[PDB]
């Protein structure tokens, strides 16, 4: 019904009281594997959940995705007041309580919830993000997966402040509906860290210099809320 990503205009986005402080628990979370999907890097996880906020119940974390561009100042999927970040990380959660599978979740409008964490290149070597960079050797080829071989805690990638926007959109490939949670505050990384992501390959062959998607028009019946 409404395609993702979009541009979130702060002037137009309203402030709703139902958007309470978000309960984020990635204490149980641990990465199982890392993948080169042909489009992007994707880390799969076991454990952890999100809750509270505007959610009717907790949604269990499923996967992590990473998006980037050919230029350091233009790589996010989502924009905020027509501003684009260096890259975007998506965290896909699903309704384990209601539905008996992730594939059943995709089929429904209340099935998926996707957090967005922005990456901004700021001349700061992120100690935590480097642990993902160290795995990129094992998935250089297109459509290859290796087990994630490192101690890694996901809640070290959360921003400083956790105020957020939210809207009914879709998954990036438009395969299913998904309620987005967009954190305006980004996390800091170095250019050399993102540089290694461009040395991955894809479906003739060519390096993945960029994998983001261009924004869409906000529908008449789609409003963006704010914490």
């Amino acid at each position: 019904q409404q395609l993702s990503p979009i541009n979130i205009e702060t002037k137009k986005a309203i402030s709703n009281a139902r958007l309470k402080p978000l309960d984020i628990h990635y204490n149980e979370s641990k990465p199982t594997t890392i993948q080169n999907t042909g489009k992007l890097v994707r880390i799969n996880f076991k454990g952890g959940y999100i809750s509270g906020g505007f959610l009717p119940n907790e949604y269990v974390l499923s996967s992590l995705h990473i998006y980037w561009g050919k230029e350091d100042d233009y790589g996010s999927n989502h924009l905020i007041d027509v501003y684009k970040y260096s890259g975007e990380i998506n965290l896909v959660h699903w309704n384990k309580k209601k539905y008996s599978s992730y594939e059943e979740a995709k089929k429904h409008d209340d099935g998926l919830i996707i957090i967005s964490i922005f990456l901004q290149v700021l001349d700061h070597k992120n100690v935590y993000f480097q642990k993902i960079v160290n795995q990129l050797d094992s998935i250089r080829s297109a459509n290859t997966s290796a087990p994630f071989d490192s101690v890694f805690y996901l809640d070290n990638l959360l921003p400083s402040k956790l105020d957020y926007f939210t809207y009914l959109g879709t998954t990036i490939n438009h395969s299913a509906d998904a309620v987005w949670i967009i954190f305006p505050t980004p996390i800091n990384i170095h250019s050399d860290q993102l540089s290694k992501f461009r040395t991955l390959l894809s479906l003739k062959p060519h390096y993945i210099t960029e994998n983001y998607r261009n924004p869409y028009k906000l529908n008449d019946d789609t409003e963006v809320y704010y914490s």
Partner: antibody
Amino acid sequence: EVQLVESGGGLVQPGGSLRLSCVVSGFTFSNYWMSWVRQAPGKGLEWVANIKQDGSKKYYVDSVTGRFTISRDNAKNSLYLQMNSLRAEDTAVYYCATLNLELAVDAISEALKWGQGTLVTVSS
Amino acid sequence: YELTQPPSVSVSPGQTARITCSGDALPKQFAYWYQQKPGQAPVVMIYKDSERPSGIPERFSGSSSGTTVTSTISGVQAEDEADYYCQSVDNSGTYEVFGGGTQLTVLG
């Protein structure tokens, strides 16, 4: 739909050699790690070995290492298993299957089916 | 590295069965559960701990806590009399393993 038509071997002399094969259809074989599982008559399931999509990583049991070897051809869309120096304890039904959905690109639930298997009897 | 499950479990029709596996890498790695009937290949009942395939009855459900993973069959039917094996990788993620296998015998 998914089908894992496990062709391959049969009777072979002890210490001999064989090459099983597993043709696949219904899902992107290229994206999955693939694995061989065996099951002796009236016995449990034993994982034999697995292989990475490109074939740059292969892992076996902490026995059977120096004589078994996996291969695969993604164009012909099939999994293979050379096995030399065969024993009586290698007498089993050999199953071709994807086990791990975390080690697979665009993972689907449908691709966890198992085939019928090929009986490998080792006897003098 | 091996996955430990009880070789035998006995239940009566209409009762809630529970078959549990143990392993050091279960905090890291997901498990799978395969039903096997006489003269037939293994078939998945539950995957990734708690995800049921289409076709499998709602009776079958899976839960996880720490180093244990527990397949659960509610209102068990005689249909369900079969061996159930749990499947997982070691903590490196390279060496795949099956459990000993649990013979689920239905009484009465």
